[PDB]
Design a protein around this ligand. Structure first.
Ligand code: HEM
Ligand code: HEM
Lengths: 173, 173
């Protein structure tokens, strides 16, 4: 099943370390997040096909990207993202050009592998209040680098179209 | 709301003229189709963002494509489609190259506008048994042209990856 739910509340596999309400309405602070394949809030999204990456990029990613659930990867960050109406109205070439040619999303992110594992979920098509649920996990040694990655991405042209962003920092129980 | 359901059964706005089980398991013949925004079978899908078309192609489409619900558009065809796992594993560049560079999907389709109106719905990501629900509607004077179009698309490289396909031909009640 390709659907995942993230329930903020009193139970779950992850302890909430902090929530940073970066842009737009935040998410209520809670004790834990419960993740279900299939309390104060619920987010959901689905795993899907590639929308932007080209073969040579997938090959580079596959050579270095780590798996989820490494024993060492006791920290995670859930980052729900919404992009603007102007973004979604653009054509596929226009969006690819912003994503990679101008913002270097994949090339920059590759600089943080193999430290950081990731998962991308989609939810605009479900009618959710965010467009994406992005998930990252890593060992503590990579926290500083991950915080640097976030600031680099927020400086990019792609991020001019981000209208809501929340960081939910987690620790594996 | 971006979700649509198509219910084959005894009630609805469309009379079934015929069902052609083109490839793979078919759909049960029924009297009518009921279309709901939000019986023998139910199909559902969502309207989404552009995945392939580039800006100059959207411009060409917007110059000529007709609205849905024209008074004369008394015939329709609902065409559920499933593509193979090999298709979905390909990268975005590989899929785009097959879709347009090799198959000329948009260029060929444009030859049948403005006679044929259309809607594309996506449903792989809902876990449905098809990947897309395609909808076409037109006046009887365009039926022969539409049949030509179907034969051209089934001859294309893109259609080498189609693994299930059904035509539900409909008449507006
Ligand atoms: C850690 C290294 C990262 C790598 C290697 C990376 C890689 C990628 C790739 C290859 C895609 C495109 C997938 C596709 O073609 O469908 C993507 C999409 C996306 N990533 Fe990243 N990413 C990283 C970090 C981040 C971070 C830290 C964020 C959030 C702050 C983020 C947010 C997203 C979003 C929102 C999308 C969807 C873009 C859209 O479809 O418009 N990524 N990522
Ligand atoms: C009538 C003229 C037609 C035109 C102008 C046309 C145009 C298009 C366009 C521009 C797209 C890409 C949308 C995007 O970028 O997301 C598309 C997708 C699609 N069309 Fe057509 N189309 C036509 C006829 C047909 C026919 C007759 C069929 C079915 C037999 C069909 C099946 C599909 C499918 C399955 C997709 C999704 C492709 C994918 O995402 O892999 N189209 N069409």
């Amino acid at each position: 099943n390709n659907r995942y739910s993230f329930i903020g509340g009193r139970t779950g596999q992850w302890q909430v370390v902090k929530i940073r309400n970066v842009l737009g309405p935040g998410l209520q602070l809670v004790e834990k997040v419960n993740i279900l394949n299939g309390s104060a809030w619920r987010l959901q999204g689905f795993a899907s096909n590639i929308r932007y990456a080209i073969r040579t990029e997938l090959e580079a990613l596959q050579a270095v990207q780590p798996m989820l659930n490494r024993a060492e990867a006791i920290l995670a960050v859930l980052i729900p993202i919404k992009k603007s109406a102007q973004w979604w109205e653009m054509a596929q070439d226009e969006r690819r050009d912003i994503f990679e040619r101008e913002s270097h999303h994949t090339a920059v992110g590759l600089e943080y592998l193999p430290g950081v594992a990731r998962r991308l979920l989609h939810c605009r098509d479900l009618g959710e209040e965010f467009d994406f649920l992005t998930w990252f996990e890593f060992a503590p040694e990579h926290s500083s680098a991950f915080n640097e990655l976030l600031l680099r991405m927020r400086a990019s042209k792609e991020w001019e179209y981000v209208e809501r962003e929340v960081e939910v920092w987690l620790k594996r129980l």
